[PDB]
């Protein structure tokens, strides 16, 4: 039945008798319920009795804490434990999911369904999970029959693409560096059954598009989308790679607990004297504002070896060696743009440069004329009507202009590498029915949330909205398939409030965009408009909260993952992106590869719209990866960490949405053969049994093939079963004594 998996059998499913024999354990449906904790926020405990507002709770550690009876919450039934899909569980709660996952992980059960989601914790030990025999025997297995596994959803999506003649794409969410790379590599390998090319290219993009964050030291800021183009007969054809939503403010500005992209630090390595020599670098990051503005450096991974890997990958790749020097010198020049002064002129608001030596080095790097660059920057020229007019700008305006120019040129550079690697990637085979794979940062939460964090949260909000809509559509399809259609209210508007407050005109983003246009803008009055337009006017917006002396609190919102508090300082300064057209034209006349190479809120909005439109055309599938503990050790798990990860992953949202319907769906035959003993004597039998049980009809929906129950009804029938079997045991003992 299951032995085909060989040595992999125990991990995907213990055994027919192991889980069954372990199933019979003592439990009280009335006095073995969960209890909130203080450090882990949740612990296993038993209640002595009912004592009003106080309850005597004893946990495994050994305590006599008390909890108000209003927030006490039931515990999972014993015979429903170790369930593959939480949607079938009869008690959906925040700690129930954590306990189910923790016990599955303890029992070496890695994968776990959560409805559509497929949570996959990452054990730090070798497993036979990726054994070639496992994948060979796993082919063609349906989603339902097979145990939960990423290969299961991969095969299901493959079959759907083959049959429906429709594109399928998969999106994975989790923590990068804890197994994300391994997960995606194994997924693409399963499709393969150009892996070498993908793995050789990945380090370069990682180096270009990663920075050290407060939580993760190798955060992948940009969103990576890889399309596996197939053939008409469902044969692998080629691969395509794209990048979207690359943050540029981080390039120019760095937070106190943040670092710029790993590139600059890697080049600053001394082990390549020639590059440093021909970049004209002091070799001290503290000498430069674009780098040392944030945290100087961290041990983390070895920068020297990473740069070796990146440059060798460039060497063994489609393009030549000269452009490697070209790109290194270009990025060095980008670095050099953090040194001009441009003092204001006397008796005038015009600006005039002072330290005109870094300008010469930059021009030599780009082969342009420093005098021309200074003339253009000081007096930008624009064409109106049929003539040209030159107007000057103050120091702040030119500073913003140069920052925007650097951000734009870096973005164009990254796009150029993406195009080059993509061109080197695919082959001549015909391409059809691509399959999408998306890698993006999760709904990160910090204690000092800022503009970039707001953008990430907004993107995750849109993704969660798309997931919710897809769930609603699938549920409607299933219900109409079963002849049931009631309470069919879409879930889009449930989450649409935040989206409207963010993007819509006179919304948060629109207000931010329109405010900075005004000649005199300040953060305090910006917050004033925000409060006037949203405080009380909009439900989601509300007063911030200050707890445990957090650094600051300016305004808070209620997201899908909970209440999030943001900050206002510095947003206006870094939101503007003024692009100087004349300087762009000067680059167009430059003598270098720059010819080939060439507010942030609006660009982010348009890019997100484009990506969502692109994804709307492909059937979605979802994967989740969660770290079990802060430390690298396995087995041990930090409950607060897992709870926070689950809250940020949206799994709780999915289970909550499932709960408000009729989550329990069970077969009539099994129900009759396992629950008819209560009142023994399939439409007439089932309706009679449920009528005699004295249960209000509203708590359940009756069908023709599957019977639909709420979470609590199963538990109620469970203690009914316990009482009935106790009575049966007593009667059997009495009869046996009668025989004696």
């Amino acid at each position: 039945e299951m032995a085909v998996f060989g040595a992999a059998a125990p991990y995907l499913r213990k055994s027919e008798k192991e889980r069954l024999e372990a199933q019979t354990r003592p439990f009280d449906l009335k006095k073995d319920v969960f209890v909130p904790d203080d450090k882990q926020e949740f612990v296993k405990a038993k209640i002595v009795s009912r004592e009003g507002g106080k309850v005597t709770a004893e946990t495994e550690y050994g305590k006599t804490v008390t909890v108000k009876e209003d927030q006490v919450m039931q515990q999972n039934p014993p015979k429903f434990d170790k369930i593959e899909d939480m949607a079938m569980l009869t008690f959906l709660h925040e700690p129930a999911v954590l306990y189910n996952l923790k016990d599955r992980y303890g029992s070496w059960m890695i994968y776990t369904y959560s409805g559509l989601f497929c949570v996959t914790v990452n054990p730090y030990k070798w497993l036979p999970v990726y054994t070639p025999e496992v994948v060979a025997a796993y082919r063609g297995k349906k989603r339902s029959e097979a145990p939960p596994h990423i290969f299961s959803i991969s095969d299901n999506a493959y079959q759907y693409m083959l049959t429906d003649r429709e594109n399928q794409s998969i999106l994975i969410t989790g923590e990068s560096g804890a197994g994300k790379t391994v997960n995606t590599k194994r997924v693409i390998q399963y499709f393969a059954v150009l892996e070498d090319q993908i793995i050789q290219a990945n380090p370069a993009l990682e180096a270009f598009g990663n920075a050290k964050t407060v939580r993760n030291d190798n955060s992948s800021r940009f969103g990576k989308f890889i399309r596996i183009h197939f053939g008409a007969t469902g044969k692998l054809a080629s691969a395509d790679i794209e990048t979207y939503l690359l943050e540029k403010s981080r390039v120019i500005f760095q937070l106190k607990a943040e670092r710029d992209y790993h590139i600059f630090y890697q080049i600053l390595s001394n082990k390549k004297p020639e590059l440093l020599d021909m970049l004209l670098i002091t070799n001290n990051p503290y000498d430069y504002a674009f780098i040392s503005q944030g945290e100087t450096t961290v041990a983390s991974i070895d920068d020297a070896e990473e740069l070796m890997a990146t440059d060798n990958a460039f060497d063994v790749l489609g393009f030549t060696s000269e452009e490697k020097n070209s790109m290194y010198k270009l990025t060095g020049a980008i670095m050099h743009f953090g040194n001009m002064k441009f003092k204001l002129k006397q008796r005038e608001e015009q600006a005039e440069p002072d330290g005109t030596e870094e300008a010469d080095k930059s021009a030599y790097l780009m082969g342009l004329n420093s005098a021309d660059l200074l003339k253009g920057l000081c007096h930008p020229r624009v064409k109106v009507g049929n003539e040209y007019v030159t107007k000057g700008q103050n120091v702040q305006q030119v500073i913003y202009a140069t920052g925007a120019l650097a951000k734009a040129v870096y973005e164009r550079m990254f796009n150029w590498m993406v195009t080059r690697i993509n061109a080197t990637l695919e082959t001549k085979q015909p391409r059809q029915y691509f399959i999408g794979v998306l890698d993006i940062a999760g709904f990160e939460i910090f204690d000092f949330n800022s503009f970039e964090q707001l953008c990430i949260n907004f993107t995750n909000e849109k993704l969660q909205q798309f997931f919710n809509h897809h769930m609603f559509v699938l549920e409607q399809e299933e219900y109409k398939k079963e002849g049931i259609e009631w309470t069919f209210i879409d879930f889009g508007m449930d989450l649409q409030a935040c989206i409207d407050l963010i993007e819509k005109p006179m919304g948060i983003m629109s207000i931010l965009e329109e405010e900075c246009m005004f000649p005199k803008a300040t953060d305090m009055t910006f917050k004033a408009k925000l409060f006037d337009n949203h405080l009380g006017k909009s439900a989601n917006f509300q007063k911030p909260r200050n707890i445990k002396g957090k650094p600051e609190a300016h305004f808070s919102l209620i997201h899908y993952a909970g209440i999030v508090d943001y900050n206002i300082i510095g947003w206006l300064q870094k939101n503007k992106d003024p692009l100087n057209e004349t300087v762009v034209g000067l680059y167009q006349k430059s003598s270098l590869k720059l010819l080939s190479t060439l507010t942030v809120s609006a660009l982010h909005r348009e890019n997100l719209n484009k990506l969502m439109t692109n994804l709307r055309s492909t059937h979605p599938h979802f994967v989740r990866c969660i770290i079990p503990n802060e430390t690298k050790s396995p087995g041990v798990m930090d409950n607060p960490l897992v709870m926070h990860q689950l809250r940020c992953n949206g799994v709780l949202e999915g289970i909550r949405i499932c709960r408000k319907g009729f989550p329990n769906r069970i077969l009539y035959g099994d129900f009759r053969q396992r629950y008819r003993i209560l009142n023994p004597a399939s439409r007439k039998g089932a309706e009679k049994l449920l009528s005699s049980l004295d249960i209000d009809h509203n708590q359940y929906k009756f069908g023709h093939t599957k019977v639909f129950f709420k979470a609590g009804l199963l538990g109620l029938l469970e203690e009914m079963r316990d009482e009935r079997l106790s009575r049966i045991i007593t009667r059997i003992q009495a009869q046996s004594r009668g025989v004696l």
């Binding site: 003993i677 009495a734 046996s736 004696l740």
Partner: protein, 146 residues
């Protein structure tokens, strides 16, 4: 009246000390094997819950046996044939109607009230087939007769 005489005859039969005095266990068994099945909880309730010493300390007479038997005769919570069949069905995991003796042995000796092993071997010997499985329905019929 005739059943009263039969019960008195049984009490006389079961006397051992020759004093016409026997503890409560003998009366409980007499009722148990003569048309009623009062569980140990019912026996304690009708006898005031004798403790470990009271079980063999105090003894009652047939005159005080009349009220308790009269009351017990009014208790009809004895289950039904279909009820027992369904209750035993819960252990038919394979659906073949065969239950190995080990599972029922563990259930009886670990769940519910306790029965002495000597009672088990005296009452549950010889009906086990070569494979050690007992038909629960056949067992039901046999326990209904003897």
């Amino acid at each position: 009246k005739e059943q009263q005489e039969d019960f008195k005859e049984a009490f006389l039969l079961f006397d051992r000390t020759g004093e016409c005095k026997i503890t409560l266990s003998q009366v409980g068994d007499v009722l148990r094997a003569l048309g009623t099945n009062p569980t140990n909880a019912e026996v304690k309730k009708v006898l005031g819950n004798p403790s470990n010493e009271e079980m063999n300390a105090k003894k009652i007479e047939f005159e005080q046996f009349l009220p308790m038997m009269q009351a017990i005769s009014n208790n009809k919570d004895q289950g039904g044939y279909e009820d027992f069949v369904e209750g035993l069905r819960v252990f038919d995991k394979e659906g073949n109607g065969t239950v190995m003796g080990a599972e029922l042995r563990h259930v009886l000796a670990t769940l519910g009230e306790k029965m002495k092993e000597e009672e088990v071997e005296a009452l549950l010997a010889g009906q086990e087939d070569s494979n050690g499985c007992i038909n629960y329905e056949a067992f039901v019929k046999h326990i209904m007769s003897v």
